[PDB]
Amino acid sequence: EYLGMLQYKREDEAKLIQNLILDLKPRGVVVNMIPGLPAHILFMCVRYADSLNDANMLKSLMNSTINGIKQVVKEHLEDFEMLSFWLSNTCHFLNCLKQYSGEEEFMKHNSPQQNKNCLNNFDLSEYRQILSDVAIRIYHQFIIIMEKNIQPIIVPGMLEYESLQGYTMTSVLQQLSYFYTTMCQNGLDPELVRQAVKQLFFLIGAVTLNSLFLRKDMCSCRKGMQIRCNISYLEEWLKDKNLQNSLAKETLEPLSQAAWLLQVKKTTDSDAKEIYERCTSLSAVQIIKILNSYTPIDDFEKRVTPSFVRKVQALLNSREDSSQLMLDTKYLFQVTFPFTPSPHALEMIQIPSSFKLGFLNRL
């Protein structure tokens, strides 16, 4: 019956962008059930323009959209929620561009009724690439906001708060939960949320380790054990959210060796060898920084002598290493946007009146 296309009169392109992107109450209800729906709407309009061969209309559409996105995020650089909604919708739109590209690669997990709605005329691969790029920009933007909202909490909870006897380590996980939920409620693909979480973990470990590299009154066995404990707490946060333990390795592993280092006896020509064999994810600079800034507060831990430090540094000669000490909070992981198909059939998509798009038409 219907085809899954959206007719728009080329003189309302502007108003379409206005009432679907710039102006948009992102919390209707259908959209709560299916977010990324605006992306589908957009691609239905695109499919309409493609069905006509009028290339100028297509290009004008894509440009108006991408500019509308760029703009709409540029207006809300302090709105985590909105940034999430548009990173989501952007990734959805790109995945629609891939899914109905017509390319053999993406028709793997397609309904026979879905393989009926591919683009029929134009190749939009270059546009897909551009979209991937802006998507990267948005992702980088929305990561920054989370990181900025959690950075002042890391240190006061991860170590300033003394467990082994007013913020605490729990608060960290509470914010992590806020971020995770906010991501999930915005149709943000699981793998994407995973990479985000990975970034967050990196940030935690980084701020922590850095504060170690600064404050001398933090390098103790006690503090090390405390840290290892908080790390296990984090692994448990992953377990609870059913996320892999792998990411916790590939983010906290340096901090583990840092905490492990703090506890281990630092005296005998054997301890040193263990420091060598175990601290494998740390630069010699970092290790030495810790061993020099290591100050004990308890009586069972014996202080580290300059001679021992020299022995260890001599043992570290076999490992070329890096000149890195601190871990900059602005490091970013390689974000990947994996193609995930859409379960929704365009033929049955309808516009809620809350979108103000009555001047459109299902084909």
CSV table of C-alpha atoms in Angstrom, one decimal:
chain,number,residue,atom,x,y,z
A,1,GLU,CA,0.0,0.0,0.0
A,2,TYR,CA,2.3,2.7,1.3
A,3,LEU,CA,6.0,3.0,0.2
A,4,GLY,CA,7.8,4.6,3.1
A,5,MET,CA,8.6,8.0,1.6
A,6,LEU,CA,7.9,11.6,2.6
A,7,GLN,CA,6.8,14.3,0.1
A,8,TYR,CA,8.0,17.7,0.9
A,9,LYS,CA,7.6,20.9,-1.2
A,10,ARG,CA,11.0,22.2,-1.9
A,11,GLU,CA,10.0,25.6,-0.4
A,12,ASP,CA,9.3,24.1,3.0
A,13,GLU,CA,12.7,22.5,3.3
A,14,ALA,CA,13.7,25.3,5.7
A,15,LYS,CA,10.5,24.9,7.8
A,16,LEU,CA,11.1,21.2,7.9
A,17,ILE,CA,14.6,21.6,9.2
A,18,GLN,CA,13.2,24.2,11.7
A,19,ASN,CA,10.4,22.1,13.1
A,20,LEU,CA,12.2,18.7,13.1
A,21,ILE,CA,15.7,19.7,14.2
A,22,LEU,CA,16.2,23.3,15.6
A,23,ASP,CA,12.8,23.5,17.2
A,24,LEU,CA,11.8,20.0,18.5
A,25,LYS,CA,10.4,19.0,21.8
A,26,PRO,CA,12.4,15.7,21.9
A,27,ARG,CA,10.1,14.2,24.5
A,28,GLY,CA,6.8,13.2,23.0
A,29,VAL,CA,6.0,9.6,23.7
A,30,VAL,CA,6.3,7.6,20.5
A,31,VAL,CA,9.8,9.1,20.3
A,32,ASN,CA,10.4,7.8,23.8
A,33,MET,CA,9.6,4.4,22.5
A,34,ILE,CA,11.4,4.9,19.3
A,35,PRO,CA,14.1,7.7,19.3
A,36,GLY,CA,16.1,8.2,16.2
A,37,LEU,CA,12.7,8.4,14.5
A,38,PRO,CA,13.4,11.9,13.2
A,39,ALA,CA,16.4,10.3,11.4
A,40,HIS,CA,13.9,7.9,9.7
A,41,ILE,CA,11.7,10.8,8.8
A,42,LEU,CA,14.6,12.6,7.3
A,43,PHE,CA,15.6,9.5,5.2
A,44,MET,CA,12.1,9.1,4.0
A,45,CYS,CA,12.2,12.7,2.7
A,46,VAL,CA,15.6,11.8,1.2
A,47,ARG,CA,14.1,8.7,-0.5
A,48,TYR,CA,11.4,10.9,-1.9
A,49,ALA,CA,14.0,13.3,-3.4
A,50,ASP,CA,16.0,10.4,-4.7
A,51,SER,CA,12.9,8.9,-6.4
A,52,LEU,CA,12.8,12.1,-8.5
A,53,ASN,CA,16.4,12.3,-9.8
A,54,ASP,CA,16.3,16.1,-9.1
A,55,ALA,CA,19.8,16.0,-7.7
A,56,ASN,CA,19.9,19.7,-6.6
A,57,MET,CA,16.9,18.9,-4.3
A,58,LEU,CA,18.8,16.0,-2.8
A,59,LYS,CA,22.0,17.9,-2.2
A,60,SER,CA,20.1,20.9,-0.9
A,61,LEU,CA,18.3,18.6,1.5
A,62,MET,CA,21.5,16.9,2.8
A,63,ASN,CA,23.2,20.2,3.3
A,64,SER,CA,20.2,21.8,5.0
A,65,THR,CA,20.1,18.9,7.3
A,66,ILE,CA,23.8,18.7,8.2
A,67,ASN,CA,23.9,22.4,8.7
A,68,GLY,CA,20.7,22.2,10.8
A,69,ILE,CA,22.4,19.6,13.0
A,70,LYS,CA,25.7,21.5,13.3
A,71,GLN,CA,23.6,24.5,14.3
A,72,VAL,CA,21.3,22.7,16.7
A,73,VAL,CA,24.2,21.3,18.7
A,74,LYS,CA,26.1,24.6,18.5
A,75,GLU,CA,23.1,26.1,20.4
A,76,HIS,CA,23.3,23.5,23.1
A,77,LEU,CA,26.9,22.8,24.0
A,78,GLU,CA,25.9,22.7,27.7
A,79,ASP,CA,22.9,20.4,27.2
A,80,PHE,CA,24.0,16.8,27.7
A,81,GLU,CA,20.5,15.5,27.1
A,82,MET,CA,20.1,17.3,23.7
A,83,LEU,CA,23.7,16.3,22.6
A,84,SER,CA,22.8,12.7,23.4
A,85,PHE,CA,19.6,12.9,21.4
A,86,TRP,CA,21.3,14.4,18.3
A,87,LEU,CA,24.4,12.1,18.5
A,88,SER,CA,21.9,9.3,18.6
A,89,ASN,CA,19.7,10.6,15.7
A,90,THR,CA,22.8,11.4,13.6
A,91,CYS,CA,24.1,7.9,14.1
A,92,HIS,CA,20.7,6.5,13.3
A,93,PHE,CA,20.5,8.6,10.1
A,94,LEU,CA,23.9,7.5,9.0
A,95,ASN,CA,22.9,3.8,9.7
A,96,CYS,CA,19.8,4.4,7.6
A,97,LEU,CA,22.0,5.8,4.8
A,98,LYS,CA,24.1,2.6,5.0
A,99,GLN,CA,21.2,0.2,5.5
A,100,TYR,CA,19.3,1.4,2.4
A,101,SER,CA,22.4,2.4,0.4
A,102,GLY,CA,21.8,-0.6,-1.8
A,103,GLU,CA,25.3,-1.8,-1.1
A,104,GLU,CA,25.5,-5.6,-0.8
A,105,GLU,CA,27.5,-5.3,2.5
A,106,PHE,CA,24.6,-3.7,4.4
A,107,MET,CA,21.7,-5.9,3.1
A,108,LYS,CA,22.9,-8.7,5.4
A,109,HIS,CA,20.3,-8.3,8.2
A,110,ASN,CA,17.5,-6.8,6.1
A,111,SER,CA,13.8,-7.9,5.8
A,112,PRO,CA,12.8,-8.7,2.3
A,113,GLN,CA,10.4,-5.8,2.7
A,114,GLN,CA,13.3,-3.7,3.9
A,115,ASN,CA,15.4,-4.5,0.8
A,116,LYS,CA,12.5,-3.0,-1.1
A,117,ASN,CA,13.2,0.5,0.2
A,118,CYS,CA,16.8,1.0,-0.8
A,119,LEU,CA,17.8,4.2,-2.6
A,120,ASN,CA,17.2,3.7,-6.3
A,121,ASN,CA,19.3,6.3,-8.1
A,122,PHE,CA,22.2,8.1,-6.3
A,123,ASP,CA,25.4,7.1,-4.5
A,124,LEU,CA,25.7,8.9,-1.2
A,125,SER,CA,28.9,7.3,0.1
A,126,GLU,CA,30.7,10.6,0.3
A,127,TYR,CA,27.8,12.1,2.2
A,128,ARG,CA,27.8,9.1,4.5
A,129,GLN,CA,31.5,9.8,5.2
A,130,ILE,CA,30.8,13.5,5.9
A,131,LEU,CA,28.0,12.4,8.3
A,132,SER,CA,30.4,10.1,10.1
A,133,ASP,CA,32.7,13.0,10.5
A,134,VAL,CA,30.2,15.4,12.1
A,135,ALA,CA,29.0,12.5,14.2
A,136,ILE,CA,32.5,12.2,15.5
A,137,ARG,CA,32.5,15.9,16.3
A,138,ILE,CA,29.2,15.6,18.2
A,139,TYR,CA,30.5,12.5,20.1
A,140,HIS,CA,33.6,14.4,21.1
A,141,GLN,CA,31.4,17.3,22.3
A,142,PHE,CA,29.1,15.2,24.5
A,143,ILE,CA,32.0,13.2,26.0
A,144,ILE,CA,33.5,16.5,27.2
A,145,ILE,CA,30.4,17.5,29.1
A,146,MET,CA,30.2,14.2,31.1
A,147,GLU,CA,34.0,14.4,31.8
A,148,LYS,CA,33.6,18.0,32.9
A,149,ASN,CA,30.7,17.1,35.2
A,150,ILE,CA,32.6,14.2,36.8
A,151,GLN,CA,36.2,15.5,37.0
A,152,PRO,CA,35.8,17.5,40.3
A,153,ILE,CA,34.3,14.4,41.9
A,154,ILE,CA,37.0,11.8,41.0
A,155,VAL,CA,39.7,12.8,43.4
A,156,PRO,CA,37.6,13.7,46.4
A,157,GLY,CA,35.9,10.3,46.3
A,158,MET,CA,38.6,8.0,44.8
A,159,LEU,CA,41.2,9.0,47.4
A,160,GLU,CA,40.6,12.2,49.4
A,161,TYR,CA,37.8,10.3,51.2
A,162,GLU,CA,39.5,7.9,53.5
A,163,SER,CA,37.6,4.6,53.8
A,164,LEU,CA,40.3,2.9,56.0
A,165,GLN,CA,39.7,5.2,58.9
A,166,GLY,CA,31.6,15.6,51.8
A,167,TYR,CA,31.8,13.3,48.7
A,168,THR,CA,32.6,9.6,48.4
A,169,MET,CA,33.4,6.9,45.9
A,170,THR,CA,29.8,6.0,45.6
A,171,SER,CA,29.0,9.4,44.2
A,172,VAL,CA,31.3,8.5,41.3
A,173,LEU,CA,29.3,5.4,40.4
A,174,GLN,CA,26.1,7.4,40.9
A,175,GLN,CA,27.2,9.9,38.2
A,176,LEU,CA,28.4,7.0,36.0
A,177,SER,CA,24.8,5.7,36.4
A,178,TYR,CA,23.3,9.0,35.5
A,179,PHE,CA,25.4,9.1,32.3
A,180,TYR,CA,24.7,5.4,31.4
A,181,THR,CA,20.9,5.8,31.9
A,182,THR,CA,20.9,9.1,30.0
A,183,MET,CA,22.7,7.5,27.1
A,184,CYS,CA,20.4,4.4,27.0
A,185,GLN,CA,17.2,6.4,27.2
A,186,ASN,CA,18.3,8.2,24.0
A,187,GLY,CA,18.4,5.2,21.7
A,188,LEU,CA,22.2,5.3,21.8
A,189,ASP,CA,23.5,2.1,20.4
A,190,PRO,CA,25.0,-0.3,23.1
A,191,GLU,CA,28.5,-0.4,21.5
A,192,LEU,CA,28.6,3.4,21.4
A,193,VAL,CA,27.6,3.6,25.1
A,194,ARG,CA,30.4,1.1,25.7
A,195,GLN,CA,33.0,3.3,24.1
A,196,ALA,CA,31.7,6.2,26.1
A,197,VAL,CA,32.0,4.3,29.3
A,198,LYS,CA,35.5,3.3,28.3
A,199,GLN,CA,36.3,7.0,27.9
A,200,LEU,CA,34.9,7.7,31.4
A,201,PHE,CA,37.0,4.9,33.0
A,202,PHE,CA,40.1,6.3,31.3
A,203,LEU,CA,39.2,9.7,32.8
A,204,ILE,CA,38.8,8.3,36.3
A,205,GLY,CA,42.1,6.4,36.2
A,206,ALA,CA,43.8,9.4,34.7
A,207,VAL,CA,42.7,12.0,37.2
A,208,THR,CA,43.5,9.6,40.0
A,209,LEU,CA,47.0,8.7,38.8
A,210,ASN,CA,47.7,12.4,38.1
A,211,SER,CA,46.7,13.4,41.6
A,212,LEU,CA,49.1,10.7,42.7
A,213,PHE,CA,51.9,12.1,40.5
A,214,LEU,CA,51.2,15.5,42.2
A,215,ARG,CA,50.5,15.1,45.8
A,216,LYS,CA,53.2,13.4,47.9
A,217,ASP,CA,50.7,12.9,50.8
A,218,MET,CA,48.8,10.3,48.7
A,219,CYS,CA,51.6,7.8,47.9
A,220,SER,CA,51.2,5.2,50.7
A,221,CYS,CA,50.5,1.5,51.0
A,222,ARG,CA,47.2,2.3,52.6
A,223,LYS,CA,46.1,4.5,49.8
A,224,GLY,CA,47.2,1.9,47.3
A,225,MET,CA,45.0,-0.8,48.8
A,226,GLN,CA,42.2,1.7,49.1
A,227,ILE,CA,42.6,2.4,45.3
A,228,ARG,CA,42.6,-1.3,44.4
A,229,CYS,CA,39.4,-1.7,46.4
A,230,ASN,CA,37.7,1.2,44.5
A,231,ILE,CA,38.8,-0.5,41.3
A,232,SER,CA,37.1,-3.7,42.3
A,233,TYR,CA,34.1,-1.5,43.1
A,234,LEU,CA,34.2,-0.2,39.5
A,235,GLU,CA,34.5,-3.7,38.1
A,236,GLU,CA,31.4,-4.4,40.1
A,237,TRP,CA,29.7,-1.4,38.6
A,238,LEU,CA,30.4,-2.9,35.2
A,239,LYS,CA,29.1,-6.3,36.3
A,240,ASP,CA,25.9,-4.7,37.6
A,241,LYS,CA,25.4,-2.9,34.3
A,242,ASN,CA,26.3,-6.2,32.5
A,243,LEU,CA,29.3,-4.6,30.8
A,244,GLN,CA,32.5,-6.5,30.0
A,245,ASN,CA,35.4,-6.7,32.4
A,246,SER,CA,37.7,-6.2,29.4
A,247,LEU,CA,37.2,-2.4,29.3
A,248,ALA,CA,38.1,-2.2,33.0
A,249,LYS,CA,41.4,-3.8,32.2
A,250,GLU,CA,42.0,-1.6,29.2
A,251,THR,CA,41.4,1.5,31.2
A,252,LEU,CA,42.4,0.9,34.9
A,253,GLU,CA,45.4,-1.5,34.3
A,254,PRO,CA,47.9,1.3,34.8
A,255,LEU,CA,46.3,2.5,38.0
A,256,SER,CA,46.3,-1.1,39.3
A,257,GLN,CA,50.0,-1.4,38.9
A,258,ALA,CA,50.3,2.0,40.5
A,259,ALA,CA,48.3,0.9,43.5
A,260,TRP,CA,50.1,-2.5,43.6
A,261,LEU,CA,53.4,-0.6,43.6
A,262,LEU,CA,52.4,1.4,46.7
A,263,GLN,CA,51.8,-1.7,48.8
A,264,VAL,CA,54.7,-3.9,47.8
A,265,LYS,CA,57.8,-4.0,50.0
A,266,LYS,CA,60.5,-1.8,48.4
A,267,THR,CA,63.7,-3.1,50.0
A,268,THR,CA,65.4,-6.3,48.7
A,269,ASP,CA,67.1,-7.0,45.4
A,270,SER,CA,64.0,-9.0,44.5
A,271,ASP,CA,61.3,-6.5,45.3
A,272,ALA,CA,62.9,-4.4,42.5
A,273,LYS,CA,62.7,-7.3,40.1
A,274,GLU,CA,59.0,-7.7,40.9
A,275,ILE,CA,58.5,-4.0,40.3
A,276,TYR,CA,60.1,-4.6,36.9
A,277,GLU,CA,58.1,-7.7,36.0
A,278,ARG,CA,54.7,-6.5,37.1
A,279,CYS,CA,54.6,-2.7,36.4
A,280,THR,CA,54.2,-3.4,32.7
A,281,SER,CA,51.7,-0.7,31.8
A,282,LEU,CA,53.7,2.2,33.3
A,283,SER,CA,56.4,4.4,32.1
A,284,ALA,CA,59.7,4.3,34.1
A,285,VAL,CA,59.2,8.0,34.7
A,286,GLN,CA,55.9,7.3,36.4
A,287,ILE,CA,57.3,4.4,38.5
A,288,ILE,CA,60.3,6.5,39.6
A,289,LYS,CA,58.0,9.4,40.4
A,290,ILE,CA,56.0,7.2,42.7
A,291,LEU,CA,59.1,5.7,44.3
A,292,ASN,CA,60.4,9.1,45.1
A,293,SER,CA,57.1,10.6,46.2
A,294,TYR,CA,56.4,7.5,48.3
A,295,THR,CA,55.9,8.6,51.9
A,296,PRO,CA,54.7,6.1,54.6
A,297,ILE,CA,52.3,6.9,57.3
A,298,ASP,CA,52.2,3.5,59.1
A,299,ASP,CA,54.9,1.6,60.9
A,300,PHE,CA,54.8,-1.7,59.0
A,301,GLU,CA,55.8,-0.1,55.8
A,302,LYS,CA,59.5,0.8,55.5
A,303,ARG,CA,60.6,3.8,53.6
A,304,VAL,CA,62.3,3.6,50.2
A,305,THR,CA,66.0,4.5,50.0
A,306,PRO,CA,67.6,6.5,47.1
A,307,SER,CA,69.8,3.4,46.5
A,308,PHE,CA,66.8,1.2,45.9
A,309,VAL,CA,65.4,3.8,43.5
A,310,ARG,CA,68.7,3.8,41.6
A,311,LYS,CA,68.6,0.0,41.5
A,312,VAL,CA,65.1,0.0,40.1
A,313,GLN,CA,65.9,2.7,37.5
A,314,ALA,CA,68.9,0.7,36.5
A,315,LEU,CA,66.7,-2.4,36.1
A,316,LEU,CA,64.3,-0.3,33.9
A,317,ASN,CA,67.0,0.3,31.4
A,318,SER,CA,66.0,-2.8,29.5
A,319,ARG,CA,62.7,-1.3,28.8
A,320,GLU,CA,62.9,1.7,26.4
A,321,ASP,CA,59.5,3.1,27.4
A,322,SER,CA,58.1,6.6,27.0
A,323,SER,CA,58.7,10.1,28.4
A,324,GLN,CA,55.1,10.3,29.7
A,325,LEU,CA,54.3,11.0,33.3
A,326,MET,CA,50.9,12.6,33.6
A,327,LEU,CA,47.8,11.4,31.7
A,328,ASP,CA,46.1,14.4,30.0
A,329,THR,CA,42.3,14.5,30.6
A,330,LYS,CA,41.7,15.5,27.0
A,331,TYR,CA,42.8,12.2,25.5
A,332,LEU,CA,40.2,10.6,23.4
A,333,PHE,CA,39.7,7.0,22.2
A,334,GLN,CA,39.2,6.0,18.6
A,335,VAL,CA,35.4,6.2,18.3
A,336,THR,CA,33.8,3.7,15.9
A,337,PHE,CA,30.3,3.9,14.6
A,338,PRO,CA,29.4,0.2,13.9
A,339,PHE,CA,26.6,-0.3,11.4
A,340,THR,CA,23.5,-1.5,13.2
A,341,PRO,CA,20.4,-2.2,11.1
A,342,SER,CA,17.0,-0.7,11.9
A,343,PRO,CA,14.1,-3.0,12.8
A,344,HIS,CA,11.5,-0.4,11.8
A,345,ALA,CA,9.8,-0.6,8.4
A,346,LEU,CA,9.6,2.8,6.6
A,347,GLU,CA,6.3,1.8,5.1
A,348,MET,CA,4.6,1.9,8.4
A,349,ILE,CA,6.2,5.0,9.8
A,350,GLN,CA,3.8,7.9,10.7
A,351,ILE,CA,4.4,11.4,12.0
A,352,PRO,CA,3.1,12.4,15.4
A,353,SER,CA,1.2,15.7,15.3
A,354,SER,CA,3.7,16.9,18.0
A,355,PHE,CA,6.3,17.2,15.2
A,356,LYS,CA,4.4,19.9,13.3
A,357,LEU,CA,4.8,18.2,9.9
A,358,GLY,CA,1.3,18.2,8.5
A,359,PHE,CA,2.6,19.7,5.3
A,360,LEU,CA,4.3,16.4,4.5
A,361,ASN,CA,2.8,13.3,2.9
A,362,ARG,CA,3.4,9.5,3.2
A,363,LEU,CA,4.0,7.8,-0.1
